[PDB]
Design a binder for this molecule. Structure first.
Ligand SMILES: [Ca+2]
Ligand SMILES: [Ca+2]
Ligand SMILES: [Ca+2]
Ligand SMILES: [Ca+2]
Ligand SMILES: [Ca+2]
Ligand SMILES: [Ca+2]
Length: 300
């Protein structure tokens, strides 16, 4: 209510303690759902938060990133408000920060923006985020790699043009190599990203096939880990939503026998997902692939 305007004014306070305190309060209010996010936006916070993305004060910067990430966990129009206030160029530049905490928070903010509609995703692409994000797939820092992967996965949850930008930026070879990761968190994210890419057109699905994903996906159908099994099933199921060449590549990789067997798994979600993938592979006709988006909040 009547304290938000003061909090917004304090984002320019010459008292650093008042400034920090207002920033933290806005960050926390924006954890409270879309009506609370709207009240923050309506109070005028966005221009000041964006401006603070240039601050050389790391405490300010980390809290500003948290506040913006939380705002961008709202509705597509709330995300669009962040984009319209100018946040993308500053966020993209922060992908080159040598400060791993700042980098992680920038990646989460960007990933949340890329969880909006196709226009919001396209704004992330147009700001030049893709080559940085693909380069971060090489990081030996698991925390950074994980947040980059979610940002890429979210971009690939757009339309065929957005998916094609992810392909054109060279993400597929790294994503396919990550299907061999012994790290289950990384593996899950690599599966989300590849499944979202395979939610596009037949030519996008074919690029996933051509990058070599099928042998690893078929091997994951033997996993005793029910979460990984469902993720591999989802990916195969999106691929099987293609045309005849795509369906035939899945058959040539040996999937049919395993999918048939997984119809007898005790877990009902696995049963159902295996049955659905099998029906698509044996059907004439196409479509029925699923896209998924991830939103995350930054709170301390
Ligand atoms: Ca001062
Ligand atoms: Ca500093
Ligand atoms: Ca560092
Ligand atoms: Ca490491
Ligand atoms: Ca492991
Ligand atoms: Ca198990």
């Amino acid at each position: 209510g009547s304290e938000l305007p003061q909090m917004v004014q304090q984002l320019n306070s010459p008292d650093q303690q008042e400034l920090q305190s207002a920033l933290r309060k806005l960050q926390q209010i924006a954890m409270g759902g879309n009506e609370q996010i709207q009240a923050v936006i309506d109070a005028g916070a966005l221009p000041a938060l964006v401006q603070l993305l240039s601050s050389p004060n790391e405490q300010i910067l980390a809290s500003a990133l948290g506040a913006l990430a939380n705002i961008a966990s709202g509705g597509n129009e709330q995300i669009q408000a962040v984009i319209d206030a100018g946040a993308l160029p500053a966020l993209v530049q922060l992908l080159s920060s040598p400060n791993e905490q700042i980098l992680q928070f920038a990646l989460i903010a960007l990933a949340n923006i890329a969880s909006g509609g196709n226009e919001q995703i396209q704004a992330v692409i147009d700001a030049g985020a893709l080559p940085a994000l693909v380069q971060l797939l090489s990081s030996p820092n698991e925390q950074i790699l994980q947040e980059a992967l979610w940002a890429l996965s979210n971009i690939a949850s757009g339309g065929n043009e957005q998916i094609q930008a992810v392909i054109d930026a060279g993400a597929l070879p790294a994503l396919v190599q990550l299907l061999s990761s012994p790290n289950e968190q990384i593996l899950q994210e690599a599966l989300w990203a590849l499944s979202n890419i395979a939610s596009g057109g037949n030519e996008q699905i074919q690029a996933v096939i051509d990058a070599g994903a099928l042998p690893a996906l078929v091997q994951l159908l033997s996993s005793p880990n029910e979460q990984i099994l469902q993720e591999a099933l989802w990916a195969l199921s999106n691929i099987a939503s293609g045309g005849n060449e795509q369906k035939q590549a899945v058959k040539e990789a040996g999937a049919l026998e395993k999918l048939e067997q997984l119809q007898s798994h005790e877990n009902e979600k696995i049963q159902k997902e295996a049955q659905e993938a099998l029906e698509k592979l044996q059907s004439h006709g196409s479509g029925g692939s699923g896209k998924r988006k991830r939103k995350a909040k930054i709170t301390w």
